[PDB]
Amino acid sequence: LWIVDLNKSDLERLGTSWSGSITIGDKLGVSLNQSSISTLDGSRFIAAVNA
Amino acid sequence: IRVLPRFSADGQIEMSLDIEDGNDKTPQSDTTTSVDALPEVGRTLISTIAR
Amino acid sequence: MIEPKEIVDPLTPDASESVNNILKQSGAWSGDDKLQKWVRVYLDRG
């Protein structure tokens, strides 16, 4: 009894994501694509890269 | 709704009916926003025959 | 709403004839493979 198994697979991930925060004049916080409070009271940006 | 229909010889329809409707008596919560937005209808049950 | 129909004739094109179009337009095809031929031949051709 002959039993035979064969497999192939090919995969690819590539690109970037972004989020961040600024503060202006102690009037306005702004946050982009964060669920955070923008707690720092100062400008932060955070890139994410994978390849 | 549950029903069982009958055809009269006089061109009349006779039905035995059981009807139940309403919102459910939830224990979880009552709050001003809920009562404001979503109507409290009663809950009512009827069983009868009509032609 | 319900809409029944009587069925008397098979499909046209065949199932196999149709599947290949999808596979090739997707690029999922593998009959182009150098190796799996030895087995796939028995399934597709037989």
Binding site: - | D18, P27, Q28, S29, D30, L45, S47 | -
Partner: protein, 79 residues
């Protein structure tokens, strides 16, 4: 038809209707304490409510079993 309810149902429901609103008080006091976990007033309230609720559910479930054990004992003698 109206939902059928027996004698054990009756006995059980007496507790639910005996505690008018406890069943919801214990939900509100939780949402509050959870909103501000470090206020002693909210703590001192929730301790009481949760105790009363625990005792209610125990007394209910024991009483229903005591009745079930009488009925099952009588039915055995019909033979």
């Amino acid at each position: 038809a109206t939902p059928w309810s027996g004698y054990l149902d009756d006995v059980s429901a007496k507790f639910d209707t005996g505690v008018d609103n406890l069943q919801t008080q214990v939900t509100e006091a939780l949402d509050k304490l959870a909103a501000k976990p470090s206020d002693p007033a909210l703590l001192a309230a929730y301790q009481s409510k949760l105790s009363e609720y625990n005792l209610y559910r125990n007394a209910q479930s024991n009483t229903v079993k005591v009745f079930k054990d009488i009925d099952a004992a009588i039915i055995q003698n019909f033979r």
